[PDB]
Structure formats: C-alpha cells, structure tokens
Design a protein around this ligand. Structure first.
Ligand SMILES: CC(C)CCC[C@@H](C)[C@H]1CC[C@H]2[C@@H]3CC=C4C[C@@H](O)CC[C@]4(C)[C@H]3CC[C@]12C
Ligand SMILES: CC(C)CCC[C@@H](C)[C@H]1CC[C@H]2[C@@H]3CC=C4C[C@@H](O)CC[C@]4(C)[C@H]3CC[C@]12C
Ligand SMILES: CC1(C)[C@H]2CC=C(C[N+](C)(C)Cc3ccc(-c4ccccc4Br)cc3)[C@@H]1C2
Lengths: 54, 218, 277, 232, 336
C-alpha cells in the first residue's frame, strides 16, 4: 500500500511537467547539429598536418 | 626523435614485462566455479581449505599435489544470472552441489538450475563436477519416506543403492550435449581427502582433453 | 604431377596465411606447424626444378644446382626435425599434462625452432660447395650431384640417413606410443579420435618417409662390398628411387591436410579469418 | 620521502671512494637516479645517471671511465664508485630522483649531499646576470639562454628551473618551462620560447633569496650553467 | 487496494499528454537535410597488453590518456598518442565491470562483482598508485561509475539502485531508487546537474543530482537497456538495448524521437556514444563490429569492423578527434 502511494505520487509528479512540441525540439536539435558541423573531426576530417594520430 | 620519451618507452617496456610475468603466473592456476541452490551443502565442499568483508564474491584458494586451485562462489548476487555469468566463461570446470536430502520440490528446482547452467551458451565446453551431498540423511529419508514423492514415476524399490543410481543417471541425462562436455559425479563422503582427490582427477581429465583439442588431436 | 605441385602450394600457403594472419594463441604446436608449413612450401616451390630435370636433363648450370641442393637439404632436414618436435610437444602436453600445467616453460618453442634451424644450417652447409653439374659418367647423362670421393660419399650418405631418418622415427615412435598408452588408459569421447589421428599420422610417416630411406640404405650397402651390381640392379635402384621420391613429394603435399585441417581449432580459426576477408 | 648520502671525507689523489645514497619513503625501484655534484663556490654539474631497472647508464665526459654508478633495489641503495680521484673532484654530491612518464616531474627531490675533498661542444646554458639587488614585494625576472633550441618536435620545451637556498639542497621550481612543481607557491611563473627563457617572481618574500639555476633535458649531457644570485 | 486504478488513469493521462504534443516527427523535418557521405574511419593505433576480456574504458579530459579495465585484474592507463603504458594498476578483485577517469585526472575508479567502488590516486609523492577509497554499501554488483568533481561519484548497481557518494567521507550522500531491474548504465549531463540511468526493466530515468528525485521516465524498448549517453547539447539522449535498437529520446518533449533499427542486425547493443557535434551515433554490437548512424536521418553511415570478438566498450574524445573501441579479444583500437 505504501509502495502504491509512492508510485501514485511519482506519477503525479511526472504528469505535472510541461512539454514543448516535437517540432520545436527537432528544430533545436537540427540547429545544434548544423551549428557545430565545422568543429567535428569525424564528420569533416582535418588535414593530416594537424592530426595527432599520424 | 626522442629526448626523454626514451625513458617513457623504457618504463612502458618494464610494465609490459611485469604484465607478461603476472599473466603467466595467473595462467598457471586452475579456476573452478562453485554453484548450487539454497541448502545445497556447499559448506562441506568449501571446508577443504588448505591455504573479506565484501558480500559479492568469495575466492577460496588452496593447493593439492602441487596444483593450485581457486574456487569462486557467487551465491551472494541474487541477480539474473545472464548479467554476470559471462564473466566465468573461461573457468576450467563448474562444481555443482546438489543435496540428496530433499519437500517443497527442492530437487525439482535444483534440476532446473542444473539444466539451465549446463545448456548455457557460454558453458558449451566447460565440464561439470556433480557433488551429491548428504547421502546418509538421504538413506534415512528413503528408509522413512518413499522416493515417489519427488519422482512418482519411479519403478524400482526403495533402497539407497538403486535410488542414488537413479538420481545420478537422471542428472546425467539432464545434459543435452553428451558430445563436447562431460559430467563427473561423486557422492560426498566423510573423508576429507577423497573429495579433493576426485576433484583433482576430474581436473586432470579436463586438462588432458583441452590439451588434446589444442594440439590438433581432436 | 603439376596437380601435386598446385595442391602442395595451395595447402601450405593457406596454412601459413591462417597461422600468420592472427599471430596469437599459438602455444607451441601452431608455431611448429607454421615452421613446418614454411619448409613444406619451400619444398613445393623447389619440386618442379627437379621435375623438369628428370623430364629431359640437367641443362641448367652449376650455381643454381648448388643453391637448389643447399635449400633442398636445409628444408628436407627441417621437415623431419619439426615433425619430431611436434611429436615431442604432443607427448609433453598429454602424458605430462598436469606436470607441464604447473610449470610450463614460457619460451621453449621459438628458441627450439631457431635451434632446429641453426642445427640444420650447420648440418647442410658443408654440402652445396661439394656438389656440381657432374660430367658424363657411365650413365651418359649429366646430373646435379656430388664429385668428392667414394668413402666420403658413403660416410656422408650414412650420416644423412641416420640423422634424418632414425632420430625422427625413434622420437615419433616413442612419443606416440606413450600417447596411445595414455589415451587407452583414459576414458571419454575425444580419446577415440585422438588415437585414430595418432595412428593415421604414424602410418603416413612410416609409409612415406621410409621407402626412399631403405632404398638409400640398400644403395649404400651395395657400394660397401656386397652383392654384385648389373644393369638390372642399377635400373631397379633408379626406378625405385624415382617412385620413392614421388611418395615423398606426395607426403609433402599431404602434411598440411594431416596436421592442420584435421583439427577443429584450425578450421574455426580459418573460417573466422575467411569471414573478414 | 628522503635520500640520505654518506661516504664523503678527505681522500688522497689517485685513491678510491664509494658514496652511498639510502632512500626511504618512496618506491625506489620506479625512479631513475642521478648523481649531481657542486664544486665549492661554483655551479651544479651533472655527473651520472642510472635508469629504473639499470637498463641504461650515462656518465659525464669528465668522469667517464673512472666512475661507476649502480643501484641495489632490494635494500633501496644507490652506489657511486669512483677511482683515480684527481684534485678537480672535490665537491658536494647530491642524490636526485626522477621518474619519466607522460606528465611527470623529474628531478623533483634532491638529497642532502656529502662533501668529498681531494688534497693536492655539446650544448651550453648561459645566464648573463650573476647577482641582482632586490627588495621584498617587487617582481623579478631571471633570464636564461641556450646555444641550441630546447623546443622539440613533440611540442615540449625541456627547460627546468631550480632554486637553491643558502645552506640547502636545490629545490625544483619549474619543469618543461611552463609547469609549476608540487608545493611551489603560485607567485612563481615561467615562460619563454625556443632559445630565450624567463622566470618571474611576482611578490617575493625573505624565503626566495638564493641561487636560481636553469637546466636542459633535451640532450643527455644535461648542462646547467651558473645560476643567478638573489639577496637583500 | 484500488490504487492500481489511479495509477493506470495517471499513466493514460501521461500517454495522452505525450500524444498531444507529437505534431510532427524528426524524420519528416530532417528529410530535407543533405545526407552525410560514407564515413570511412581507419585504425591508427592498437593497444596491446591486456590478457583477458576488456570490460570498460574511459577517455581523459585532455583527450590523450585513457584508462582500460580488464578481467585479468588490470587497470592499465595508456598514452594514446605513443601507445605507451603510463600506469598499470593491479586490482584486488579481478571481476571488474566498469572504470572511470576523473575530470582533473588525479583519480581513477573501478568496480565490479565485489559490490565495491575503489578510488585510486594517481598523483602521489611515493611514485606509485595506491588505492585511496573503497566505497561500499551497494548490495549488488556495480555496473557503472562516473566522477562529478573529484569528490563526488555516482555509481549504479545491480540491486536496482544508484548512489551519489562523497569520496572524502565514504558514505552515500544520496540514494536514487525507482528502477525495477538492474541498472546497467548511466551518463552525466554536460553540466553535471542531471543524469539518465537505463535499467533491465526496459526503462530509462532522469534523476536530479541535487535533492535526488526522479524527474521523468522513458519507455519504448522491449529488452534490457545496456548503454546510454547524453547528447552534446544536453537536451536529449540515446539508449541501446538487446532488441537491436538505438532509440533516441528528447528530454523537453518527453517523448521518443527516433529509432535506429536495421533488419540485418539481430544482436544486442553493448556501447552507445555520440560525436562532438551530435551528428553521428556510434554503437557497438555483438557482430564484433561497430556501426555509425546518421543521428538526424537514422541511416547507417559506416562500419568499424576489425575486432575478433564482441565490442564491449566504446568512447569518443572530448575534442572529438579519435574514437576508442575495446572488445573481448583483449585489444583497444583508436580510429580516426
Ligand atoms: C661462408 C661459406 C662457407 C658458407 C656461407 C655462404 C652463404 C653466405 C651463401 C649465401 C648465398 C650463397 C651463394 C649463392 C649463389 C652462388 C652462385 C654459384 O655460382 C656459386 C656459389 C654461390 C656464390 C653461393 C655461395 C654460398 C653463399 C654465399
Ligand atoms: C637459398 C639458400 C642458399 C638460403 C638458405 C637459407 C634459407 C633457405 C633459410 C635459412 C634461415 C631460414 C629462416 C629462419 C627463421 C624464420 C622465421 C620464421 O618465422 C619464418 C621462416 C624463417 C624466415 C626461415 C625461412 C627459411 C630460411 C630463410
Ligand atoms: C622431382 C622428382 C619426382 C624426380 C627428379 C628428382 C627428384 C628428387 N630427388 C633427386 C629424388 C631427391 C629427393 C629425395 C627425396 C625427397 C623427399 C621429399 C619429401 C619427403 C620425403 C622425401 Br625422401 C625429395 C627429393 C624426384 C624424382
């Protein structure tokens, strides 16, 4: 019974939060991915002059 | 090309030498995995000690005929076995303890555990040493109560010899491979040396088979 | 015959590639097998030279005669020393399994291989500077052979026969007899295949390596004050030598099949290597 | 952690001696060991080096042939056996520990040293100034210069700054020209480039007076160059 | 009694609330994004010296030194640039399942079947690495551990719980409960204010480090979640499980965002990691090889085969130059 009340209170806590739309989150994720594209040595490899691993 | 990186390389080489020596020393040891159910009787097997605060794993270290044995007991985990059993893939052998004095169908759950362990995807080559404990108590039990309580389909009479043989053969037939692994069975006796001698013989046989596989003779 | 050449080259190359692609977990017998495969592929590479020699004549020269004789002697002695080493290894790992488990020597395989190669080098160094493309004898056909006198010839031939047949045969017989006895005493399922493979290996060795050596021995004793020789005797000796060397070459091409592909570990390793080709 | 030396004293020319250095409080087997000598009223001079496990041994030119450095790890002792002691070997000898891996600080600890008195090209480090008069609370700059650039292809500049207080063994301040040692006050700083290097003290106290030495660790002869004195 | 009805009603309300804010999908929005090419990565270094299965590894914050834990009781710390073994630490218990590297680099962490998290001090005046702390109190095996600020450490255990420990004292500052199965992995947010933990009940949970509550739970997997990692932004994460999926969830939307399944793959997933920009998702499988996924389009962009056994650990440097993968054949490979 105590675990039931704990679960129900946890469910209320989780249901009391506010959510943004999926489109906004997707746009933010895409914006972050495109804004740091040049600083990714796995997407765009750096020239071998400045590559510490040979 | 190097100024004091040469000393770093020398230190790395010394570390490699130490690692190689430690690895050889560890590889010159026999490792066994002790397993069983509750009230199985692991105490009478681990009592053959001849050499911690953590309740996560127990390491029993001993020696016999100059051979070095380390036995791992993992009975204090109470988690899903599939989560941590793969850590013991390369153990030389499993030592499965089964109590003959059981009734809440304890023998049924012991058989289920044995079937699960034997047919595991990791223990497809490690041998199993079966220890049937409490033979005298089982003799008194069968003198009092029939064996049909656990196995109603038993056809033989009620004596220690044939009942023990039936249980042993049923446990042996619980194996589903019979071609790449062997099951060595012993009835634990009061003598402290016979059990260790049986373990030594089984380990020697396992080592011989492993060397046969290594040398290309199998 | 070219079929034998192709099969020997293919088998030895495959064995060497499989054992060399992943140079790990080669305890002792895999390393010995790798060295044996190298010697075997050297024999298979050398064989068509003498093949075309027997086809028409030794119209090749003298320096390549010398180098071919040297390389052939080196690899031929290696092919027997490594077989004896493999038999000794298998004897140690089975008869003394629990004894060698406790204190198994760490680097007794690579040092043994180098010692075998060095002993073979000192064994077959003073030979190649002692043969040439000999002139026309009573056989009216030049041959890449020896020229130094008869007593030295028979001394060298007897020493080569002994060290090269007797020692490998004695070591193999003792080791495999003890292995068979131990396997007979033991119980299980792998022991049956173990005895079958051991018997097959011993039979193959005693059936292939012996004929040429017993024909060499009868040639030696004939040239040591024995039975008179006529045209028929010499012709029979030569045709026997040809047939026995054919048997030896076929054993050379057969060794990788009998020593590598019959083991489950090697097959699994080679499949694993193939899957990532 | 301490290194205690013994075996000094007065020796006739052409004799022989054996200096001992007993180490306690650290893993002696994991540290390379140097013998570094200082002549009376003169700069420090490198003498000998033995690695960990005695794999490699290096000697200075002036002592090569007649000196021998060795170590015994079970007893945690370092030996320097020297024969044919000429009149130029009278000095004070120091036992220095140094461990080499990525990001380590070699030459971090120095022994007390022992005095031995005897009766009767590669690379140079230059410190132009020999003594400056300074007042507490002000900043000081000490400059060092090398014949060959100390920068390496891996980006490391092998320059070390040591401080020797009056009557005490030298104490490491800076390693690799830009790294502060363990326990050295923040006010010390080090910088430079290639050939010219500087050490800066922001707000000195009475404990910073003494002799400052620069040292190279690029080529193993390991020259020092006379230090700069700071007093008042 | 009837409180199960209220719990089911609240669950239905949560599901409806999640549905009401699901107007579009990330795949539809990213359909216009130009795809990345065939990501070709080559092995630069191979680190040898482990004689057993390598179970965990972790990069240093300087992107040069990395710790590697193996089942032979070894905690080798390597310099990746020159493949030099900087340190070799022997463990009292050889059954290790996790290892961590402190952000400052002065400490390392270890743990496994002994239910103890050992903290080793790397920078001592004696010249040797000695164990400085032996945090104990977890009942099950330790599955993960992550340093916060060289004095606080978060450890997830196999007894369906997590804990936050103060190292200098040795006692659990906080305890996180709420999972049903064993917690198999965790990852810290870039600001180290929240952390996600994935458990064997096919659920992930977001915990607040301070005051120790569970903010939101995420479901969608059909098997045990073995790996988890945060997005570089910090507002999303990815979870790999035994159903051969690399599901990516978003914190703010409180919904599943994208699945990364493929018909060819049928195995479980051991490790999951992102790139510096978050455009790539690297996942280790039981097919003995790693897969690279376009994080925005769920399209495979490369394979990192070259391991002879199951790839158990995988990580990317903070500067993002290299990727370290360790497998059960006792080898670590750096890819670039
Ligand atoms: C030093 C002696 C006793 C034995 C060692 C010789 C070694 C080095 C081998 C290696 C290559 C060999 C040479 C290879 C080929 C030829 C050409 C031939 O037309 C004459 C012999 C000669 C010149 C060989 C002589 C022996 C040789 C030089
Ligand atoms: C042509 C004649 C004159 C030359 C005789 C020397 C040759 C045939 C012999 C002598 C030394 C031998 C080598 C000694 C050891 C090794 C290392 C092993 O891992 C592969 C085989 C290899 C590389 C051997 C190949 C054959 C070898 C090169
Ligand atoms: C190419 C030919 C078919 C034709 C011309 C020259 C030949 C070689 N030779 C001259 C007979 C020498 C020779 C002898 C024995 C072996 C041998 C090899 C492996 C295993 C055991 C032995 Br034993 C090999 C070569 C043979 C006969």
């Amino acid at each position: 019974i105590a675990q039931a009340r704990k679960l129900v209170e946890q469910l209320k806590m989780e249901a009391n939060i506010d959510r943004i739309k999926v489109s906004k989150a997707a746009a933010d994720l895409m914006a972050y991915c495109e804004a740091h594209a040049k600083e990714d040595p796995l997407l765009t490899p750096v020239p071998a002059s400045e590559n510490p691993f040979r | 090309l190097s100024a004091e990186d040469k000393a770093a390389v020398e230190r790395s080489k010394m570390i490699d030498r130490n690692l190689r020596e430690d690895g050889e020393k560890a590889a010159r040891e026999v490792k066994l995995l002790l397993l069983g159910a509750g009230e199985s009787g692991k105490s009478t097997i681990v009592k053959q000690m001849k050499i911690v605060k953590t309740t996560g794993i127990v390491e029993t270290h001993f020696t016999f005929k100059d051979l070095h044995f380390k036995m791992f007991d993992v009975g204090a985990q109470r988690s899903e076995r599939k989560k941590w059993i793969h850590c013991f893939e390369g153990v030389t052998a499993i030592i499965f303890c089964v109590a003959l004095s059981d009734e809440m169908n304890r023998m049924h759950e012991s058989m289920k555990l044995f079937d699960s362990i034997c047919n595991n995807k990791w223990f497809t080559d490690t041998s199993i040493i079966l220890f049937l404990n409490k033979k005298d108590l089982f003799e008194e039990k069968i003198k009092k109560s029939p064996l049909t309580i656990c196995y109603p389909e038993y056809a033989g009479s009620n004596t220690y010899e044939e009942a023990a043989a039936y249980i042993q053969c049923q446990f042996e037939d619980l194996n589903k491979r019979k071609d790449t692994k062997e099951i060595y069975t012993h009835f634990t006796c009061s003598t402290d040396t016979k059990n260790v001698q049986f373990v030594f013989d089984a380990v020697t046989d396992v080592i011989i088979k492993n060397n046969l596989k290594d040398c290309g003779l199998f | 015959y070219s079929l034998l050449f192709l099969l020997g080259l293919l088998g030895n190359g495959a064995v060497a590639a499989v054992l060399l692609s992943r140079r790990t977990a080669l305890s002792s017998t895999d390393t010995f097998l790798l060295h044996l495969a190298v010697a075997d592929t050297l024999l298979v590479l050398t064989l068509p030279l003498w093949a075309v020699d027997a086809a028409v004549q030794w119209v090749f020269g003298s320096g390549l005669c010398k180098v071919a004789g040297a390389l052939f002697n080196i690899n031929f002695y290696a092919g027997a020393l490594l077989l004896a080493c493999i038999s000794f290894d298998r004897y140690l790992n089975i008869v003394h399994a629990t004894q060698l488990y406790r204190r198994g020597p760490p680097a007794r395989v690579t040092l043994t291989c180098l010692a075998v190669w060095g002993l073979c080098l000192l064994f077959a160094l003073p030979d190649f500077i002692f043969l040439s493309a000999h002139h026309d004898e009573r056989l009216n056909a030049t041959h890449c052979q020896y020229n130094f006198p008869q007593v030295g010839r028979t001394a060298l031939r007897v020493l080569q026969l002994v060290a090269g047949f007797l020692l490998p045969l004695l070591v193999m017989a003792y080791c495999y007899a003890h292995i068979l006895a131990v396997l007979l005493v033991s119980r299980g399922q792998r022991r049956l295949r173990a005895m079958r493979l051991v018997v097959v290996v011993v039979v193959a060795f005693a059936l292939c390596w012996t004929p040429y050596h017993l024909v060499v021995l009868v040639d030696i004793l004939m040239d040591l004050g024995a039975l008179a020789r006529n045209c028929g005797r010499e012709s029979r000796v030569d045709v026997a030598k040809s047939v026995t060397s054919g048997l030896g070459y076929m054993h050379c091409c057969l060794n990788p099949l009998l020593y590598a592909f019959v083991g489950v570990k090697f097959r699994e390793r080679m499949w694993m290597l193939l899957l990532r080709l | 952690v301490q290194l205690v030396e013994s075996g000094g004293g007065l020796v006739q020319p052409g004799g022989s001696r054996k200096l001992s250095c007993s180490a306690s409080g650290f893993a002696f087997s994991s540290f390379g060991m140097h013998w570094v000598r200082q002549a009376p009223e003169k700069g420090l001079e490198w003498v000998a080096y033995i690695s960990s496990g005695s794999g490699t041994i290096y000697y200075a030119d002036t002592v090569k042939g007649r000196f021998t450095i060795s170590r015994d790890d079970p007893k945690n002792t370092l030996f320097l056996q020297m024969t044919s002691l000429r009149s130029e070997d009278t000095a004070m000898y120091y036992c220095v520990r140094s461990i080499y891996y990525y990001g380590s600080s070699p030459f971090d600890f120095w022994g007390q040293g022992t005095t031995l008195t005897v009766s009767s090209s590669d690379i140079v480090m230059t410190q132009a100034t020999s003594s400056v008069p300074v007042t507490p609370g002000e900043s000081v700059s000490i400059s060092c210069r090398s014949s060959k650039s100390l920068l390496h292809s891996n980006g490391n500049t092998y320059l070390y700054w040591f401080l020797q207080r009056p009557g005490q063994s030298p104490q490491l301040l800076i390693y690799r020209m830009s790294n502060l040692a363990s326990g050295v006050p923040d006010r010390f700083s080090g910088s430079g480039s290639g050939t010219a290097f500087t050490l800066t003290i922001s707000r000195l106290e009475a404990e910073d007076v003494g002799v400052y030495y620069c040292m190279q660790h690029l080529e193993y002869p390991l020259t020092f160059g006379a230090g700069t004195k700071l007093e008042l | 009694d009837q409180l199960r009805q209220e719990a089911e009603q609240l669950k239905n309300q949560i599901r409806d609330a999640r549905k009401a804010c699901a107007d579009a999908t990330l795949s539809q929005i990213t359909n216009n994004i130009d795809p990345v090419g065939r990501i070709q990565m080559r092995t630069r270094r191979t680190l040898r010296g482990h004689l057993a299965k390598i179970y965990a590894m972790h990069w240093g914050t300087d992107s040069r030194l990395l710790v590697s834990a193996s089942q032979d009781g070894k905690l080798i710390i390597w310099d990746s640039y020159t493949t030099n073994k900087v340190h070799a630490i022997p463990l009292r218990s050889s059954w290790v399942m996790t290892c961590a590297y402190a952000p400052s680099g002065n400490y390392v962490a270890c743990g496994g079947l002994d239910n103890i998290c050992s903290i080793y001090n790397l920078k001592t005046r004696e010249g040797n690495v000695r164990v400085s702390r032996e945090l104990a109190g977890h009942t099950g095996y330790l599955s993960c551990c992550r340093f916060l600020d060289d004095n606080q450490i978060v450890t997830s255990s196999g007894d369906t719980t997590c804990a936050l420990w103060d190292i200098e004292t040795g006692q659990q500052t906080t305890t996180f409960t709420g999972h049903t199965g064993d917690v198999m992995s965790l990852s810290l947010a870039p600001d180290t204010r929240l952390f996600v933990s994935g458990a064997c009940d096919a659920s992930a949970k977001l915990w607040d480090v301070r005051e120790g509550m569970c903010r939101q739970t995420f479901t969608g997997h059909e098997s045990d979640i073995n790996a988890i990692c945060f997005f570089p932004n910090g507002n999303a994460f990815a979870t790999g499980s035994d159903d051969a999926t690399c599901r990516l969830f978003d914190l703010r939307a409180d919904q599943e965002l994208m699945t990364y399944s493929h018909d060819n793959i049928i195995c479980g997933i051991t490790s999951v990691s992102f790139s510096k920009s978050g455009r790539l998702l690297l996942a280790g499988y039981d097919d003995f090889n790693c897969n690279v996924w376009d994080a925005l389009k769920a399209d495979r962009a490369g394979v990192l085969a070259g391991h002879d056994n199951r790839v158990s650990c995988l990580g990317v440097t903070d500067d993002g130059m290299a990727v370290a993968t360790g497998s059960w054949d006792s080898f670590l490979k750096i890819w670039n």
